[PDB]
Design a protein around this ligand. Structure first.
Ligand SMILES: NC[C@@H]1O[C@H](O[C@H]2[C@@H](O)[C@H](O[C@@H]3[C@@H](O)[C@H](N)C[C@H](N)[C@H]3O[C@H]3O[C@H](CO)[C@@H](O)[C@H](O)[C@H]3N)O[C@@H]2CO)[C@H](N)[C@@H](O)[C@@H]1O
Ligand SMILES: [Mg+2]
Ligand SMILES: [Mg+2]
Ligand SMILES: [Mg+2]
Ligand SMILES: [Mg+2]
Ligand SMILES: [Mg+2]
Ligand SMILES: [Mg+2]
Ligand SMILES: [Mg+2]
Ligand SMILES: [Mg+2]
Ligand SMILES: [Mg+2]
Ligand SMILES: [Mg+2]
Ligand SMILES: [Mg+2]
Ligand SMILES: [Mg+2]
Ligand SMILES: [Mg+2]
Ligand SMILES: [Mg+2]
Ligand SMILES: [Mg+2]
Ligand SMILES: [Mg+2]
Ligand SMILES: [Mg+2]
Ligand SMILES: [Mg+2]
Ligand SMILES: [Mg+2]
Ligand SMILES: [Mg+2]
Ligand SMILES: [Mg+2]
Ligand SMILES: [Mg+2]
Ligand SMILES: [Mg+2]
Ligand SMILES: [Mg+2]
Ligand SMILES: [Mg+2]
Ligand SMILES: [Mg+2]
Ligand SMILES: [Mg+2]
Ligand SMILES: [Mg+2]
Ligand SMILES: [Mg+2]
Ligand SMILES: [Mg+2]
Ligand SMILES: [Mg+2]
Ligand SMILES: [Mg+2]
Ligand SMILES: [Mg+2]
Ligand SMILES: [Mg+2]
Ligand SMILES: [Mg+2]
Ligand SMILES: [Mg+2]
Ligand SMILES: [Mg+2]
Ligand SMILES: [Mg+2]
Ligand SMILES: [Mg+2]
Ligand SMILES: [Mg+2]
Ligand SMILES: [Mg+2]
Ligand SMILES: [Mg+2]
Ligand SMILES: [Mg+2]
Ligand SMILES: [Mg+2]
Ligand SMILES: [Mg+2]
Ligand SMILES: [Mg+2]
Ligand SMILES: [Mg+2]
Ligand SMILES: [Mg+2]
Ligand SMILES: [Mg+2]
Ligand SMILES: [Mg+2]
Ligand SMILES: [Mg+2]
Ligand SMILES: [Mg+2]
Ligand SMILES: [Mg+2]
Ligand SMILES: [Mg+2]
Ligand SMILES: [Mg+2]
Ligand SMILES: [Mg+2]
Ligand SMILES: [Mg+2]
Ligand SMILES: [Mg+2]
Ligand SMILES: [Mg+2]
Ligand SMILES: [Mg+2]
Ligand SMILES: [Mg+2]
Ligand SMILES: [Mg+2]
Ligand SMILES: [Mg+2]
Ligand SMILES: [Mg+2]
Ligand SMILES: [Mg+2]
Ligand SMILES: [Mg+2]
Ligand SMILES: [Mg+2]
Ligand SMILES: [Mg+2]
Ligand SMILES: [Mg+2]
Ligand SMILES: [Mg+2]
Ligand SMILES: [Mg+2]
Ligand SMILES: [Mg+2]
Ligand SMILES: [Mg+2]
Ligand SMILES: [Mg+2]
Ligand SMILES: [Mg+2]
Ligand SMILES: [Mg+2]
Ligand SMILES: [Mg+2]
Ligand SMILES: [Mg+2]
Ligand SMILES: [Mg+2]
Ligand SMILES: [Mg+2]
Ligand SMILES: [Mg+2]
Ligand SMILES: [Mg+2]
Ligand SMILES: [Mg+2]
Ligand SMILES: [Mg+2]
Ligand SMILES: [Mg+2]
Ligand SMILES: [Mg+2]
Ligand SMILES: [Mg+2]
Ligand SMILES: [Mg+2]
Ligand SMILES: [Mg+2]
Ligand SMILES: [Mg+2]
Ligand SMILES: [Mg+2]
Ligand SMILES: [Mg+2]
Ligand SMILES: [Mg+2]
Ligand SMILES: [Mg+2]
Ligand SMILES: [Mg+2]
Ligand SMILES: [Mg+2]
Ligand SMILES: [Mg+2]
Ligand SMILES: [Mg+2]
Ligand SMILES: [Mg+2]
Ligand SMILES: [Mg+2]
Ligand SMILES: [Mg+2]
Ligand SMILES: [Mg+2]
Ligand SMILES: [Mg+2]
Ligand SMILES: [Mg+2]
Ligand SMILES: [Mg+2]
Ligand SMILES: [Mg+2]
Ligand SMILES: [Mg+2]
Ligand SMILES: [Mg+2]
Ligand SMILES: [Mg+2]
Ligand SMILES: [Mg+2]
Ligand SMILES: [Mg+2]
Ligand SMILES: [Mg+2]
Ligand SMILES: [Mg+2]
Ligand SMILES: [Mg+2]
Ligand SMILES: [Mg+2]
Ligand SMILES: [Mg+2]
Ligand SMILES: [Mg+2]
Ligand SMILES: [Mg+2]
Ligand SMILES: [Mg+2]
Ligand SMILES: [Mg+2]
Ligand SMILES: [Mg+2]
Ligand SMILES: [Mg+2]
Ligand SMILES: [Mg+2]
Ligand SMILES: [Mg+2]
Ligand SMILES: [Mg+2]
Ligand SMILES: [Mg+2]
Ligand SMILES: [Mg+2]
Ligand SMILES: [Mg+2]
Ligand SMILES: [Mg+2]
Ligand SMILES: [Mg+2]
Ligand SMILES: [Mg+2]
Ligand SMILES: [Mg+2]
Ligand SMILES: [Mg+2]
Ligand SMILES: [Mg+2]
Ligand SMILES: [Mg+2]
Ligand SMILES: [Mg+2]
Ligand SMILES: [Mg+2]
Ligand SMILES: [Mg+2]
Ligand SMILES: [Mg+2]
Ligand SMILES: [Mg+2]
Ligand SMILES: [Mg+2]
Ligand SMILES: [Mg+2]
Ligand SMILES: [Mg+2]
Ligand SMILES: [Mg+2]
Ligand SMILES: [Mg+2]
Ligand SMILES: [Mg+2]
Ligand SMILES: [Mg+2]
Ligand SMILES: [Mg+2]
Ligand SMILES: [Mg+2]
Ligand SMILES: [Mg+2]
Ligand SMILES: [Mg+2]
Ligand SMILES: [Mg+2]
Ligand SMILES: [Mg+2]
Ligand SMILES: [Mg+2]
Ligand SMILES: [Mg+2]
Ligand SMILES: [Mg+2]
Ligand SMILES: [Mg+2]
Ligand SMILES: [Mg+2]
Ligand SMILES: [Mg+2]
Ligand SMILES: [Mg+2]
Ligand SMILES: [Mg+2]
Ligand SMILES: [Mg+2]
Ligand SMILES: [Mg+2]
Ligand SMILES: [Mg+2]
Ligand SMILES: [Mg+2]
Ligand SMILES: [Mg+2]
Lengths: 49, 272
RNA sequence: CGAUGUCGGCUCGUCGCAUCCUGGGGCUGAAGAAGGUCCCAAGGGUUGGGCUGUUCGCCCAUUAAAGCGGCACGCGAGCUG
RNA sequence: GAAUGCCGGCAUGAGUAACGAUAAAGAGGGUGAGAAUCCCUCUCGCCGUAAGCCCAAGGGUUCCUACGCAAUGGUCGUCAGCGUAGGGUUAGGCGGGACCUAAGGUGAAGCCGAAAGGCGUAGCCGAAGGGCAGCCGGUUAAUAUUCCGGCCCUUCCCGCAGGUGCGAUGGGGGGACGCUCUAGGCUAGGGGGACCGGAGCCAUGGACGAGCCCGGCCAGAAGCGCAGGGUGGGAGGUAGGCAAAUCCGCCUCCCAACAAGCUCUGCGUGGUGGGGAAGCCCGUACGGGUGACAACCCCCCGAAGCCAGGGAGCCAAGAAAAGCCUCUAAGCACAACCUGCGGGAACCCGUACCGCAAACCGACACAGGUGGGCGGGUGCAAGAGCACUCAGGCGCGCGGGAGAACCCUCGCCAAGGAACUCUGCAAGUUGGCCCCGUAACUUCGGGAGAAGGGGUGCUCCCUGGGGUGAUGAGCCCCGGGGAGCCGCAGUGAACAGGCUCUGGCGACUGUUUACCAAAAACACAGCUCUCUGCGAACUCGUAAGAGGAGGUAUAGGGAGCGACGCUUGCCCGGUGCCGGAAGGUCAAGGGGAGGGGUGCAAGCCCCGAACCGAAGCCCCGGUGAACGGCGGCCGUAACUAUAACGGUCCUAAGGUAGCGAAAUUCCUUGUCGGGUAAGUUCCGACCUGCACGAAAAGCGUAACGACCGGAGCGCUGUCUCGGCGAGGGACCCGGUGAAAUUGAACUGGCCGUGAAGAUGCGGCCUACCCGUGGCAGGACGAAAAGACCCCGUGGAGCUUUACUGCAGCC
RNA sequence: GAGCUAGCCCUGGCCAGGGUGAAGCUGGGGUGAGACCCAGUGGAGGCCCGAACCGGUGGGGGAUGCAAACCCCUCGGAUGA
RNA sequence: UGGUUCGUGGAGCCAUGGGGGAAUCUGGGCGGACCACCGCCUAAGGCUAAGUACUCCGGGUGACCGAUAGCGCACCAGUAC
RNA sequence: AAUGACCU
RNA sequence: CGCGGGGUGGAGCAGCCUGGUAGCUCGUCGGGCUCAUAACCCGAAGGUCGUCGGUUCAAAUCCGGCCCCCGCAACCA
RNA sequence: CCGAGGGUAGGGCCCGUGACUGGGGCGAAGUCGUAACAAGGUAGCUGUACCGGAAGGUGCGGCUGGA
RNA sequence: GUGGGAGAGGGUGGUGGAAUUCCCGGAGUAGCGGUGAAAUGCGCAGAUACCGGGAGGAACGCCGAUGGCGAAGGCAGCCACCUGGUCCACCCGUGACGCUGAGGCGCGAAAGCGUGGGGAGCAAACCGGAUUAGAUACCCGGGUAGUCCACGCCCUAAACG
């Protein structure tokens, strides 16, 4: 059947990107938490040009 | 007149379509004056706030003239009468000698080629606009302003009118389509005649689809729902309500008057 | 009750006798024939349809007879639902 | 030592199930340590509206090559989408960005919010939409619309040359638009040819023949030719297009009325360029040479594509902005602008490879999911259907035997033909086209493919229309008539309704429980009730604000009913809602009669009755397509039976029409009648309606229904009652090799006994040791800390005239 | 978290081929003029048959599956809600 | 209304959303309703070290662990997945 | 402000 | 089987709970109006209160045991 | 070739029968009321509509077969 | 044919006043409605009676007749338009063109049906208050369809002279 993962580079970027997270206090805290944690990747790596 | 069909299909046996014979050879509209992009959307910034809206034909807005006092004294020739997707009525395309082209909402009896004009001057004829004062008591009228210089707001639906009843210092009394008795300021413009397309009420949609074409989504009964959804939801195999009938939001829907009492508008109203 | 699947049908059977038939017998208000009634006897047999989820039952057509009951109201790690 | 404990390790089932579609394999020859599995050749099978091809998404090195097989591959592996290394992705013209706007996002001004933040006209951002200049070939192991060849374009900048008032983010025009059906002419694509070109081939009885086989194309500027799209030309007046305008708009006169003229596309043709089979020979994993100085011609079919902004009809009435054209304002008119021609300038990002899949989403080389374009030939009425088949790609990454039970999928059957069974569940019959031929009923459409029938191949003869063509040959579409041949059988294979009768429910097409319910439930037009006068009601939000609606009573919100036909009674006592400037009650507040505590006193501070006080409730009315309700007991007719009639109690009123053992009937298989040999079901009636009933509508209703019930015909493996055969598994051999479960086991029957159902206790009986294929009665078998039931002063969803608050409203 | 699912908004795309034959148009007929009736043309429809395509009706298989919804046969819709 | 031990209590003091609304030393607040008396303070502007809290970081020590422990990480870990 | 058994 | 409501003249109903009096309507009987009947008018009669027990000075009434009458309930399995 | 007839399928008319149901005719002295005929005690009759155990009543219009 | 005449003949548009009902203001009290008699009902929440203003629908007093017009049904305030039948005079024109009429077609009171509009009064059904033995009737108070309009049906009558 159709499963739940339907990859889209634009969606992933607009949805979970560094700039989206930065836009709101909710998201800014996510970066803070991930930084303090020592996460190698703050936001998902969306590729291609 | 109303177009009628033979039952060559079920739902074609009741279905019924407007007569478009008053639609003069001018079916597609007029750029310049209108259209605008019209912005379909069944809801506010976010959430739906009027249920069951959506779908249905794309539309172009015809930006019509609801304040006729710009062109006081300037007459215009009625050039055409065309279909307007965004109202029950039809619209008149008129050419002002000025050059400017406006649409007026099209009254009953309006003929193409006719002369029409607005102002204190203005022969009392179908199509003309006047401040309510100079209009003879008892004449039927439409596109009436509520307060002066604020635009036509009463009687624009197809086949509607108001009748002038009497006067009272600065106000003339109106009898509105609903039957209400209203004091409306003398200085309010209103155009003589009834609205026309009066056979609008006689049309039978005929099937479900037609409803959808006009963007009317299926309306579901409270009875059909559940207690979480509606006061009428549940219980077992059908149910008669079990309380005084209500909206989904709990207010009673048979009888409960809802106009706020202390409206300052009150001292200008005399009926139902 | 940290689970014994619960009606009926099907399939496969098997046992008890307080025997429906068939075999033996006493009495009979047993002429004969056919019955009644009791005692011995389970070795084998104990039909096909209509209605009902039906068990049961009531019919239709038969039959020597169309037996009653147990086996977790036998049988779902066998089916049916 | 136990916690269905936790992490880890190793066992059991077990060489057991399985090895992922039943499209299929066989051989010869290579390479190699090792070949069913790698390479090559011959044969066979499968796909072919794909299982072929080209894009987009996603993926990200999987592409190519060299060297390799530990692991990954469900077996093997010399092979690989795997390991190691190296190579490979070339653009002004393709796509995206130095262009535009959509929803939406953001947001200067502005508004709002305890804070965080929320809105928000302009502007910006935002694309499978608009705009914009490359076509055909050749090359690499791997890239090419990118490199190269030929042919053809577009932007800038600097020049010269020739024109003109040039000139804006501003005015206008244009861009610019639906759906259905469509004309004319073209192109893509395809069929045929005695014609042109071509290696070649006479086979096995015949054929050296208009014999077989292969191929007869592609691009192409100007200039033409043919199709078609856009569009009127003047002159005045002017108050609108938010400054101006010669532009546009409106008005009036002339001239065209036409594509005549300007243009602008498309298609042919075009200088010229390129390509160019079968077969044969070769050595590649593959390509090369020759065939060739290849030929490159004539017909026919022909689009859904092009000319495109074509045409007709319809109602539900069908984006925006830039480019572009034009107008003028500031300015400037040595600038600038247009046209021609030369030289110069033309960046950034993507380009590999997979892409209906072993490279994407499904943990997997997963029988699932994935948008667009091409998708040839022949026949079958047509077609993207079906059968076979070009091109091209596959035989699905375990094989080998055997020929049991059983299961799966499949074929056939005596005689009977639903006796099967909850039910004809399943399977069968029926089946395409043409022509006959069709009932009740009906809303006049339907019902209808009703039902029931006949024809259907091939050959020869005569003959009617068209299309392309000159009015002709052919070539291509539809027909009619007559003879005759073959077989059991002519839509000879594949694709392709069983039918009727009568009820229940819902009018209908539709929708729903993704993953057990597709329905009589939801929706539906349509009917009524009710709210709403516009800053509407209502909804969302603390607000600003937005929806409603750029709507205005023929409109919008809410509610119930649910096409249609005939209809929808009685009760306003209770509850609700609506209407009542009286009255009763009624909080804060007003008012202070009166009293209290202190002070030597002025005073200061407390209570506090009258009386004046809102909504709300009480009270008076209204209203049932508002919540709802719509009786009991006696007696009576000149045979009995029964009761039109009467008495009486009660109510707010005592159920009317129509239906009625019903999706409703307990007693109940009610009692009659019909279908049956027989009918707890079904149909028609009777009414004793436990417990129908009129918008939670009542009684009907043609049509419709993968809905539910009853019946009959047809036809059958459903059955009597099974039988045989087919293939895939099951079994045997080789290869890889799980799982749930598992206190430990040396794990028999009976009659007992025991926590009341024992392999384990007692007595007796039986029984050599160990497997293999099978069957499921048992191990209260596995699986899930029973769903039901109760318990807990456990938890949630829901309700209301439970309590108590809160929003909201008054 | 709306990359699954539900609704709506913006912008594109897709729907082989067959049937039935509404309005209208045109001709003939009828009338004082009509209504209307015949042909012919025309091509409407939550119309019919049936691929793609969207579904999921019944039965069987599958149940440590190919698959945490699949497969075969059969079936509904297929110019429209 | 909040704050204080103070939950409306005899409920003061301190802060304050709403209403009314003074005074400048013979002026004002407070000492738990209130009044008298005796006393204590000087509101409606602001700043001000140190003593105090914490441990990303460095150092020292341990009747603290010794790789199923000790931080999740002794090992290129907030990594693989 | 109702009614008047049957035939004659 | 459980529950709670009910038996009163000839008929239909009151009267009980706050024990001592049984009342309303119809019917029956006698008289009148009428030619007669009914309607109407005037008079009159009529009640072991289902039974059995006793609580009391006294029971239709209050309390127990039976008997018929009506209504409700009979659920999860 | 046609063809009597037999067969199958479907229509058309006509007759008989059917639980039950509708009204009707007729049958000396059963029931309920009083509709009509005298202004029949509400003039009657009437077409239609609604209602009522029953005659009947009422609304609307009409008639003289009433003053 | 020419010239005239009377008419509530028909269709459309417009308009007038009297009265009833409802609303508003004023003034005003203790009752009003109604019947054979009453009661239901309305009224101290300010009724009936009276005055001023407004709204609305329907029907047209006197003229009016024992009258007129029409084929019938039927037609009545006034105004204008469109429009049929008819009477007289003159004897001008045509020249037998005539009468009737199966079927057909058209019209056709009231009640009734469909769609939308309107609804003051009246009023089937319905609810009451009386009357009666009982009243589903007569009488009284309320009251809905309907009565009114547009369009489309229905086709009846003591449609009668
Ligand atoms: N009589 C013919 C038609 O039927 C009905 O008439 C029938 C009945 O109504 C009528 O019944 C009458 C009754 O009305 C009258 N008041 C009392 C009488 N005893 C009855 O009489 C009837 O029954 C008895 C026995 O049963 C028979 O013997 C007698 O013949 C018969 N007429 O008897 C008739 C039967 O014969 C209509 N009323 C009458 O008007 C109509 O025209
Ligand atoms: Mg919002
Ligand atoms: Mg948002
Ligand atoms: Mg609904
Ligand atoms: Mg529900
Ligand atoms: Mg609720
Ligand atoms: Mg129910
Ligand atoms: Mg409910
Ligand atoms: Mg248990
Ligand atoms: Mg256990
Ligand atoms: Mg014995
Ligand atoms: Mg004997
Ligand atoms: Mg036996
Ligand atoms: Mg059965
Ligand atoms: Mg049993
Ligand atoms: Mg047995
Ligand atoms: Mg038992
Ligand atoms: Mg059992
Ligand atoms: Mg079941
Ligand atoms: Mg232990
Ligand atoms: Mg473990
Ligand atoms: Mg093996
Ligand atoms: Mg085993
Ligand atoms: Mg095995
Ligand atoms: Mg195996
Ligand atoms: Mg495989
Ligand atoms: Mg094939
Ligand atoms: Mg790699
Ligand atoms: Mg490779
Ligand atoms: Mg290699
Ligand atoms: Mg391997
Ligand atoms: Mg594998
Ligand atoms: Mg090797
Ligand atoms: Mg590699
Ligand atoms: Mg740059
Ligand atoms: Mg940009
Ligand atoms: Mg925008
Ligand atoms: Mg914006
Ligand atoms: Mg914002
Ligand atoms: Mg932009
Ligand atoms: Mg684009
Ligand atoms: Mg481009
Ligand atoms: Mg390549
Ligand atoms: Mg080039
Ligand atoms: Mg210029
Ligand atoms: Mg512009
Ligand atoms: Mg030979
Ligand atoms: Mg060819
Ligand atoms: Mg060319
Ligand atoms: Mg200007
Ligand atoms: Mg070549
Ligand atoms: Mg066009
Ligand atoms: Mg812009
Ligand atoms: Mg590439
Ligand atoms: Mg490529
Ligand atoms: Mg691949
Ligand atoms: Mg594809
Ligand atoms: Mg594979
Ligand atoms: Mg796959
Ligand atoms: Mg995969
Ligand atoms: Mg797909
Ligand atoms: Mg093909
Ligand atoms: Mg073909
Ligand atoms: Mg075909
Ligand atoms: Mg195919
Ligand atoms: Mg057989
Ligand atoms: Mg046979
Ligand atoms: Mg048969
Ligand atoms: Mg049977
Ligand atoms: Mg049987
Ligand atoms: Mg059946
Ligand atoms: Mg079947
Ligand atoms: Mg039928
Ligand atoms: Mg349905
Ligand atoms: Mg489901
Ligand atoms: Mg279905
Ligand atoms: Mg299902
Ligand atoms: Mg309806
Ligand atoms: Mg708004
Ligand atoms: Mg809006
Ligand atoms: Mg509405
Ligand atoms: Mg319903
Ligand atoms: Mg009702
Ligand atoms: Mg009430
Ligand atoms: Mg009530
Ligand atoms: Mg009341
Ligand atoms: Mg009130
Ligand atoms: Mg007070
Ligand atoms: Mg006070
Ligand atoms: Mg004192
Ligand atoms: Mg009050
Ligand atoms: Mg019955
Ligand atoms: Mg029977
Ligand atoms: Mg049968
Ligand atoms: Mg029978
Ligand atoms: Mg029945
Ligand atoms: Mg019932
Ligand atoms: Mg019901
Ligand atoms: Mg109802
Ligand atoms: Mg219904
Ligand atoms: Mg039906
Ligand atoms: Mg359907
Ligand atoms: Mg269905
Ligand atoms: Mg079988
Ligand atoms: Mg077999
Ligand atoms: Mg086999
Ligand atoms: Mg042993
Ligand atoms: Mg035992
Ligand atoms: Mg033992
Ligand atoms: Mg032992
Ligand atoms: Mg074994
Ligand atoms: Mg076992
Ligand atoms: Mg087994
Ligand atoms: Mg078991
Ligand atoms: Mg178990
Ligand atoms: Mg438990
Ligand atoms: Mg539990
Ligand atoms: Mg408790
Ligand atoms: Mg979505
Ligand atoms: Mg089609
Ligand atoms: Mg068609
Ligand atoms: Mg036609
Ligand atoms: Mg369709
Ligand atoms: Mg279909
Ligand atoms: Mg179809
Ligand atoms: Mg396609
Ligand atoms: Mg679905
Ligand atoms: Mg199954
Ligand atoms: Mg299908
Ligand atoms: Mg506190
Ligand atoms: Mg406090
Ligand atoms: Mg307290
Ligand atoms: Mg304050
Ligand atoms: Mg203070
Ligand atoms: Mg103080
Ligand atoms: Mg102090
Ligand atoms: Mg103190
Ligand atoms: Mg102090
Ligand atoms: Mg200070
Ligand atoms: Mg400080
Ligand atoms: Mg240690
Ligand atoms: Mg550790
Ligand atoms: Mg260690
Ligand atoms: Mg750790
Ligand atoms: Mg009598
Ligand atoms: Mg007599
Ligand atoms: Mg006699
Ligand atoms: Mg007497
Ligand atoms: Mg339960
Ligand atoms: Mg008959
Ligand atoms: Mg009488
Ligand atoms: Mg009378
Ligand atoms: Mg009478
Ligand atoms: Mg009448
Ligand atoms: Mg009546
Ligand atoms: Mg006249
Ligand atoms: Mg007054
Ligand atoms: Mg003469
Ligand atoms: Mg005649
Ligand atoms: Mg009539
Ligand atoms: Mg009438
Ligand atoms: Mg009407
Ligand atoms: Mg309607
Ligand atoms: Mg009245
Ligand atoms: Mg009387
Ligand atoms: Mg009355
Ligand atoms: Mg009616």
């Amino acid at each position: 059947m159709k499963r739940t993962w339907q990859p889209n580079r634009r969606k992933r970027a607009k949805t979970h990107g560094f700039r989206a997270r930065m836009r709101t206090p909710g998201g800014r805290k996510v970066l803070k938490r991930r930084r303090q944690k020592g996460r190698w990747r703050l936001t998902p790596a969306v590729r291609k040009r | 007149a109303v177009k009628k069909f033979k039952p060559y299909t079920p739902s074609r046996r009741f279905m019924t379509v407007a007569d478009f014979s008053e639609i003069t050879k001018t079916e597609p509209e007029k750029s310049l004056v209108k259209p605008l992009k019209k912005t379909g959307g069944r809801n506010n910034q976010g959430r739906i706030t009027v249920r069951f809206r959506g779908g249905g034909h794309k539309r172009l807005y015809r930006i019509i003239d609801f304040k006729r006092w710009d062109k006081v004294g300037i007459p215009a020739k009625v050039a055409a009468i065309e279909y307007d997707p965004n109202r029950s009525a039809r619209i008149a395309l008129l050419h002002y000698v000025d050059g400017e082209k406006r649409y007026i909402i099209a009254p009953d009896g309006l003929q193409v080629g006719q002369q029409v004009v607005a102002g204190p001057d203005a022969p009392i004829q179908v199509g003309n606009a006047l401040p309510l004062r100079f209009i003879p008591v008892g004449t039927v009228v439409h596109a009436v302003e509520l307060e002066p210089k604020k635009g036509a707001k009463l009687a624009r639906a197809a086949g509607t009118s108001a009748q002038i009843q009497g006067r009272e210092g600065d106000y003339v009394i109106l009898r509105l389509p609903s039957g209400e008795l209203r004091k409306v300021h003398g200085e309010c413009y209103a155009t003589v005649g009834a609205v026309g397309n009066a056979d609008h009420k006689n049309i039978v949609l005929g099937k479900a689809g037609r409803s959808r074409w006009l963007g009317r989504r299926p309306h579901v009964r409270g009875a059909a729902m559940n207690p979480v959804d509606h006061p009428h939801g549940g219980g077992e195999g059908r149910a008669p309500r079990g309380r005084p009938p209500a909206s989904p939001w709990g207010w009673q829907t048979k009888g409960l008057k809802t106009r706020k009492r202390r409206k300052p508008s009150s001292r200008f109203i005399i009926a139902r």
